[PDB]
Write an enzyme that holds these catalytic residues in place. Structure first.
Site, PDB file in Angstrom:
ATOM      1  N   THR A  86       0.836  -1.238   0.000  1.00 36.57           N
ATOM      2  CA  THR A  86       0.000   0.000   0.000  1.00 36.57           C
ATOM      3  C   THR A  86       0.856   1.268   0.000  1.00 36.57           C
ATOM      4  OG1 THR A  86      -1.396  -1.259   1.462  1.00 36.57           O
ATOM      5  CG2 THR A  86      -1.961   1.101   1.128  1.00 36.57           C
ATOM      6  N   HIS A  92       9.965   5.007  -5.116  1.00 38.64           N
ATOM      7  CA  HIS A  92       9.503   5.288  -6.499  1.00 38.64           C
ATOM      8  C   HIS A  92       9.827   6.735  -6.900  1.00 38.64           C
ATOM      9  CE1 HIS A  92       7.964   1.382  -6.559  1.00 38.64           C
ATOM     10  NE2 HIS A  92       6.780   1.609  -5.960  1.00 38.64           N
TER      11      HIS A  92
END
EC number: 1.1.1.37
Lengths: 301, 302, 311, 311
Positions: free
Chosen positions: B114, B170
């Site tokens: 998540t 990321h």
């Protein structure tokens, strides 16, 4: 030079996308995933997402999404998953088949699209291919559900359960429970009549059982798998005995129809339709099923 | 008696579903796919559909869908894919999911997807009471997967012979080491001109958004699910893979009290070890910048 | 008509048999196990045994033993594993010349029945034997490959994995040249999860790993008492077969014919290659240090020494 | 902590070594290949060769060779491939008596170090040898199994598939009892894609296939010249190991201990079983015809005759 098989999957909805991923995973060939230009960017996203999984799962396969059938050029196999009220899917079967046929004249075709008997007939007529090169999927999916339901009932591996299915889904299905076994033992010997009759019946409703749970759209895991087993049998020339929706020319005493029958699926597609001796009840049951098949073919323009 | 491994996947969205199916197909154990009560029937239908695939694909796995955390009991591993003030919102879901997960599976390994995975894995770590080795985030495997795909296209070679190396998270939080990225052992800097190799690195940074933008609704699910399955297999089969993972630091790289994307040994005890590399001064500055953003997101938690 | 790849395996000893069994298990194609007339029955018996395993392991692959090379016709790939090991008293020259004569006799039969096949050679000494198959075959250099470097990297990776207690999957080796004294390893291009091994393994132990790789074949010979390794050689052949049949474009070390690469020509040498649908797609040329260049020069000197023993 | 399953294979002959290699390949757990102190080095050589194949074939598994049963400690499963083929001068009785002693000696060591393992026995004659391992171990009946029917069904399916020219995956065989004349095959419970073989194969060629299945072990002996089958026998053992370790609940034929099934007590017999995480979950009883009951009674007399040879 050694080159990979080329497989095109028409329809980038859940069944189509899943079938593309399963083919790439198995390294059966390069995969092109096709849908309409309005769905081009979702389709590209799905295929690239799949390709980005390849270093991790450890398979070598190219996967591209497209709306241009030019990219399907020289496909060894095409899997038709497009469509959604039979004439709706007939016209889609015709527009698709024309485009597929131009870019890959030598291709084999497997049709998922419901109702399969009539949709595969359309794809057969429109293509002008010989009958061995146009197959529909139905019996493998019904067989898969029936095996899942019997494995749950006996608490045994699905590997050792066999179903036997002539004809299509739901009320059109013609199961031979006498050719249905656990480890080769007739199921009539293992499961009492009420529970066995209840499994045949869950198999009939199996497609609807999944729609009802989802609330939107239909099954895709088990249908995709069913398409992939059929594709593998052709591409690896396995000469599997699998139920397929095949064009009949006298077998079971019928002609000029697609029907769900036992076939030998190999490097030439349908190697042969297998003709069984049915009991009077099975003959009667199949006659009824065929009337339902003729009833849908007359619905075609 | 020989018993199958049990894996629960929390979240029955496209990543959750795809993960459950991949796990079953590999015969890694029985799979329990979980979501909220409002979605229970869709969950059972996905699970039944997957199981009905099993006679054809020829795997023996049990797949069941539920909205009842009691069906997750005695899971060896749980994969959290649940979620969508993004931080504040998802924090709530992580605390609530984790409280149910540990009640029923007190000895499980937890892998968190998540986003933001640094703060969400931290939240699962603190809420759970588990030791750091047992609570793992996924980030770098997915980034390395995209990088290798892009490099494989660039050089026209198998993905199998391409290596990426990724610290931190990321996009702009990503700290790639292209000097530790290879084709058949050959440094990529020797094989790809700087302009195209920076483009591949930038493409990796943006890779997640690139799928989001093409899909129009939702994010990537295939490569994320695969990335999760590689980490599950490393633990379940005690492989001792070297893989990038979101791991809790107690000194490593000079950081402590945070989760950060770092190279890890992943085995049967979960994170066996965080590997400490000698970084150049630039790479230390990039990682400090990446850690700054991690601490920034932790300061939005409650 | 979708038709199965066909692979002929020449030689029905442990390495040949294991190679056939692995190719079939992987459903890479139909397998024809070939040996001399005098062993036709043992060759058919091993092939039928492997075939009888196929329902239990669950693979569709045909496997037949034979001594009739007509049964190899239209082979996409042929794997040559035939050849002699040396005995006490045998001259270096006699080992080379005996194995050279086998290579010639086998290749003649192969190219007659499969004029378009790719050929992968295992037979020791692999540089001079792959050269021999090449010249006899009349094939272009992309279609005749030898195996050496894959097996060396396999042992190297096994030892490194054991030293570091990590998956063999995350260890890489890099070797030019052949086996033993002729191996030219590049520890600087050898990693654990992308980390240079010299940053992880102290020099004495890493040097010992290299030496154990050099003697790796000898180690299995001494343990077994009779004959040499077969599992790891067999697997090494299969990875190269698969690279070609599935057009994978793998980077793998192979025994490749050189026409200028690394400054050499007219020889087979272990070098990094791209292996795909066209066989050797490319010999990869690396920036070598002065030491590596000198070690490769001494390795080529041994290749040329053995090539001078050819008749 | 997640920890790998552990399998010990006793006997490093071709079946045992091939079994060890197939188990490692499937990542079913870590493998310990055991033989006598005299063959320690060869056993270690084969295990190291198999392990050095694991980076190339892409499997993580520990494989060691040993002569020390202490290295088998805490095995989840032990596979017994040990035993002697008939020497000249030896009676059937002497072959029985000799292997019985090997079973007892092996089983004593196995249970000392692995008190909770499941044991699968290949050693011929398997009915009497599995019975020996059963009684020596003091284990419950679910924990001690022999292999027979899987191998016979593998040979049968191979022969049926070459007759009909279809996938071995779509053929089934059904065999009660053991090899050769002891075999009680039910052709009526044998199918292609669910179709009785009696409706697809003429009686003369179906009879030849049933006969070839009876002689199947000997067809391999006669072709080889110097040993028996190993590839199909190893595969058969591996399918049974997998059914237990992955708790698959397969229906597979197995050598199982009977307490009343088919009317027989106190014997091991080839029968259909459910094979899962508890070993033999159940012996399945069929309703047999009078001919079939008579054939099984003849086969059971063969089993009792051999059991009388035990000391």
């Amino acid at each position: 030079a050694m080159k990979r098989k080329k497989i095109s999957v028409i329809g980038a909805g859940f069944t189509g996308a899943t079938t593309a991923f399963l083919l790439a995973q198995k390294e059966l060939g390069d995969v092109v995933l096709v849908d309409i230009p309005q769905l081009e960017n979702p389709t590209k996203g799905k295929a690239l997402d799949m390709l980005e999984a390849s270093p991790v799962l450890g398979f070598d396969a190219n996967i591209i999404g497209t709306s241009d059938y030019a990219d399907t050029a020289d496909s060894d196999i095409v899997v038709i998953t497009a469509g959604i009220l039979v004439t709706t899917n007939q016209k889609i079967m015709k527009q698709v088949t024309k485009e597929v046929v131009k870019y890959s004249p030598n291709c084999y075709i497997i049709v998922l699209t419901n109702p399969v008997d009539a949709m595969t007939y359309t794809v057969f007529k429109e293509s002008g291919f010989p009958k061995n090169r146009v197959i529909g999927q139905s019996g493998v999916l019904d067989t898969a559900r029936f095996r899942t339901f019997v494995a749950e009932e006996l608490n045994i591996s699905v590997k050792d359960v066999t179903g036997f299915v002539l004809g299509g889904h739901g009320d059109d299905m013609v199961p031979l429970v006498r050719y249905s076994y656990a480890g080769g033992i007739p199921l009539e010997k293992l499961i009492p009549k009420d529970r066995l009759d209840a499994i045949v019946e869950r198999t009939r409703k199996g497609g609807g059982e999944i729609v009802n749970l989802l609330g939107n759209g239909s099954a895709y895991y088990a249908p995709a798998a069913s398409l992939v087993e059929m594709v593998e049998a052709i591409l690896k020339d396995q000469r599997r005995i699998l139920p397929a929706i095949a064009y009949l020319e006298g077998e079971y005493g019928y002609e000029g129809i697609y029907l769900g029958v036992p076939t030998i699926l190999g490097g030439n597609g349908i190697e042969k339709v297998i003709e069984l001796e049915l009991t009077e009840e099975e003959k009667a049951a199949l006659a009824k099923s065929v009337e339902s098949v003729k009833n849908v073919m007359r619905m075609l323009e």
